[PDB]
Swiss-Prot record:
Disulfide bonds join C22-C25, C78-C82. Belongs to the glutaredoxin family. GO terms for molecular function: glutathione disulfide oxidoreductase activity. CDD domains: GRX_GRXh_1_2_like. Residues 2-105 form the Glutaredoxin domain. One of its GO terms (cellular component) is cytoplasm. This is Glutaredoxin-1. Its main location: cytoplasm. It comes from Sus scrofa (Pig). Gene3D superfamilies: Glutaredoxin (3.40.30.10). The modification N6-succinyllysine is found at K8. The gene is GLRX. The modification N-acetylalanine is found at A1. It is found in: Cytoplasm. Has a glutathione-disulfide oxidoreductase activity in the presence of NADPH and glutathione reductase. Reduces low molecular weight disulfides and proteins.
Amino acid sequence: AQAFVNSKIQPGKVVVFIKPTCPFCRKTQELLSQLPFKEGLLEFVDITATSDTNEIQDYLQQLTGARTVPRVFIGKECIGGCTDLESMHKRGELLTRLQQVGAVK
């Protein structure tokens, strides 16, 4: 669980931890898939594809303050879930943020 999520999160990368059958995971995927990411800099990680799904949620609770998916990380910074990603979008902050970390083409 620990080494698994810690290998995924990296400076300059966006990673969204998702589950199948998760309406908000899908909305998050819809928003970020449009953006001109460079290759390898956006990843959706299904936590059900590992045996220890609940232990991963436990570790995200410890790391971020919540265990709920979607869990969105921009670099090592967990910005939150769908709601928080959507606010940055509405405010126009998201593209600025992604350009600063060099995630965009």
